[PDB]
Design a binder for this molecule. Structure first.
Ligand code: ANP
Ligand code: MG
Lengths: 320, 13
């Protein structure tokens, strides 16, 4: 079994092919607290131990570990998150080989050549031993690494002359990863990583607002509100203090404007790209402003209906 | 296809 694991700070995305050749996808939010959870009734809890420390998957706890940083790539929580994603995917527990991911600036030196040091640090992290309480964990056999952003442009780069270049803008929870890549993947003009520019800018602001509105929860719940920002009834069902909905929506709106302006300023630093692609969960939030800011003709702008999965799908199309 | 997929393999390390 070979499983493609785009292991992002916010969500693990999995893609893999079944025995009968059908392709499956699974997403798994990285919300874990440093304590075992308690099972009541029909609730199956996932309690893990790694290096003498206990964790549980907990989607609602305000004490869920905040994972919005570079260190997380090689962290213990990462290993828990990836095992948990495997254990909730529907695949039978087993040995597996995996292809995981690194941020551009971790995967590449300033010359756009692999940073074998960091690439190996990544592979070694998945050697850490982990226990699931009252159950068996998958065993992680062979580990290979790919860069983030770039693999998502695979299909599009195929029908692109080697003179055209595609700007792939990957906005995740922690990091803005930008790459400019020549047609047929014949070259890489430029990479760029900003690990202080993520949707967490918004997540963090929404989380604080929710707490003020007496809806104290995890980063995940805050993202859940960002995802449903356009649904006033959803907002009204989730947010406890009915009198403070505008505090959440406006806090969200201001951080979104900040997100936008910061992202657009970053684009000003690229030039000569003929095509523009926007991928990641953040794509939904910035795609209009990007298309507009780049004056790229409609046909040269690329945005899928499942932006969060663009990367892991590309990893699959390439490496499976 | 073949040229792109070829180059794609440098993305796997
Ligand atoms: N449909 C949606 N609409 C708006 N925002 C979304 C949507 N889906 C996901 N998001 C946001 O996008 C973020 C998750 O993006 P994702 O691309 O999965 O990050 P990641 O890859 O896990 N983190 P990173 O390590 O920075 O690449 C969350 O913070 C969500 O708030
Ligand atoms: Mg990502």
């Amino acid at each position: 079994m070979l499983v493609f694991i785009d292991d992002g700070s916010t969500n693990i995305k999995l893609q893999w092919q079944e025995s009968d050749g059908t392709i499956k996808q699974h997403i798994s939010p990285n919300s874990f607290k440093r304590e075992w959870a308690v099972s009541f009734g029909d609730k199956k809890v996932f309690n893990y131990t790694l290096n003498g420390e206990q964790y549980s998957f907990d989607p609602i706890s305000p004490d869920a570990v905040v994972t919005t940083n570079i260190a997380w790539q090689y962290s213990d929580v990462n290993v828990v998150a990836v095992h948990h994603a495997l254990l909730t995917s529907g695949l039978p527990v087993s040995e597996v080989d995996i292809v995981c991911t690194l941020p551009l600036t971790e995967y590449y030196d300033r010359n756009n050549q692999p940073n074998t040091e960091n690439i190996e640090r990544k592979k070694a992290n998945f050697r850490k031993k982990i226990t699931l309480n009252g159950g068996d964990t998958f065993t992680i056999k062979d580990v290979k690494v790919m860069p983030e952003s770039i693999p998502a442009g695979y299909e599009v780069l195929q029908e692109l002359d080697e003179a055209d270049s595609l700007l792939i803008i990957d906005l995740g929870g922690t990091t803005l990863d930008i790459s400019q890549v020549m047609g047929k993947l014949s070259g890489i003009s430029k990479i760029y990583g900003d690990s202080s520019l993520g949707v967490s800018l918004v997540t963090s602001a929404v989380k604080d607002a929710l707490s003020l509105a007496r809806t104290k929860g995890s980063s995940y719940l805050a993202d859940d509100i960002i995802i449903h920002r356009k649904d006033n009834n959803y907002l009204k069902q989730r947010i406890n203090d009915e009198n403070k909905i505008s505090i959440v929506t406006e806090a969200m709106n201001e951080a979104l404007r900040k997100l936008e302006q910061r992202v657009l300023n970053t684009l000003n630093e690229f030039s000569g790209y003929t095509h523009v692609m926007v991928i990641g969960g953040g794509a939904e939030l910035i795609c209009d402003a990007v298309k507009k800011h780049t004056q790229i003709r409609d046909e040269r702008f690329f945005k899928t209906n499942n932006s969060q999965y663009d990367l892991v799908n590309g990893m699959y199309l390439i490496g499976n | 296809d073949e040229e792109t997929k070829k180059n794609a393999m440098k993305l796997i390390n």
